Design an enzyme around this catalytic site. Sequence first.
Site, mmCIF file in Angstrom:
data_model
loop_
_atom_site.group_PDB
_atom_site.id
_atom_site.type_symbol
_atom_site.label_atom_id
_atom_site.label_comp_id
_atom_site.label_asym_id
_atom_site.label_seq_id
_atom_site.Cartn_x
_atom_site.Cartn_y
_atom_site.Cartn_z
ATOM 1 N N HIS B 40 -7.255 -4.091 -2.085
ATOM 2 C CA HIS B 40 -8.276 -3.067 -1.784
ATOM 3 C C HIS B 40 -8.469 -2.086 -2.966
ATOM 4 C CE1 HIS B 40 -5.001 -0.270 -0.405
ATOM 5 N NE2 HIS B 40 -5.822 0.575 -1.003
ATOM 6 N N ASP B 84 -3.081 -8.061 1.415
ATOM 7 C CA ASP B 84 -3.573 -6.947 0.591
ATOM 8 C C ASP B 84 -2.821 -6.931 -0.760
ATOM 9 O OD1 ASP B 84 -4.939 -4.716 -0.242
ATOM 10 O OD2 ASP B 84 -3.931 -3.279 1.054
ATOM 11 N N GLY B 173 -3.996 7.840 -2.691
ATOM 12 C CA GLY B 173 -3.643 7.759 -4.136
ATOM 13 C C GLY B 173 -2.369 7.038 -4.515
ATOM 14 N N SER B 175 -1.780 4.071 -2.957
ATOM 15 C CA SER B 175 -2.260 2.684 -2.782
ATOM 16 C C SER B 175 -1.970 1.849 -4.000
ATOM 17 C CB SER B 175 -3.767 2.656 -2.682
ATOM 18 O OG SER B 175 -4.136 2.581 -1.342
ATOM 19 N N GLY B 176 -1.442 0.654 -3.753
ATOM 20 C CA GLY B 176 -1.155 -0.323 -4.784
ATOM 21 C C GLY B 176 0.171 -0.160 -5.475
#
Lengths: 47, 221
Positions: B40, B84, B173, B175-176
């Site tokens: 995402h 994801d 923020g 994320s990942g």
Amino acid sequence: KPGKCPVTYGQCLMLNPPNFCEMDGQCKRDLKCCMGMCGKSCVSPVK
Amino acid sequence: IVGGYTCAANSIPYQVSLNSGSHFCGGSLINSQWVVSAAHCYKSRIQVRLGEHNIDVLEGNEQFINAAKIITHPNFNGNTLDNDIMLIKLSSPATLNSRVATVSLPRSCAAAGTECLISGWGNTKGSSYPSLLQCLKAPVLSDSSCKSSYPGQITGNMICVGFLEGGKDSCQGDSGGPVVCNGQLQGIVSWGYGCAQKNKPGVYTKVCNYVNWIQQTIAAN
Ligand SMILES: [Ca+2]
């Protein structure tokens, strides 16, 4: 377009998630433009 | 990271920042040319920033390297966030000193209660991004706990890491970014219901399910 956006429950942990549409007219067939788990996209409507 | 502490400068050498004008996602350096992040967090243009502590001040240590290719998991579902995971190939390899290092893939999935380190530059509350890399020690939760918190929404590809009391969690923020347990990348910051809420721990891509896909995708690119 007729119908509702589906109910959603999580959110992706990105501040400004991507929008793939801004309005229903940008969506094919009966699909609506809805905020989902991660930004706006064309999804099937509900009842 | 809500309820965490500021990391020691450069103590998380595999931690990257994904930037396209500003920081928007974290990432994990897994080899000299490959970063693992969340699908995402996909953008058509990304600059990977390695060696960062203060994302808002050049401290000397940084490598800024554009992405040359970006491969999302073929089964990524943007509406449920299943699968994801994405891979980023750097346009040239990173130099591995003490401030930029790789993190290992898992040998197997982490047992419930395994203590992990989560990190990133996401909000520490409202908002906004701290300058300095944040850190948070948190254990893997049982699938049972994960599915009671999010009934119907946890796939075989998601793990919950954190505290059901709340107070401590990844946030917008992060994320990942990494979840690292006994020196292995076990989770990728994916999603949740708010941050640090009670009975709403963070949900993470279960990296142990993707060891083969990671190697195969790299092999082909
Ligand atoms: Ca810096």
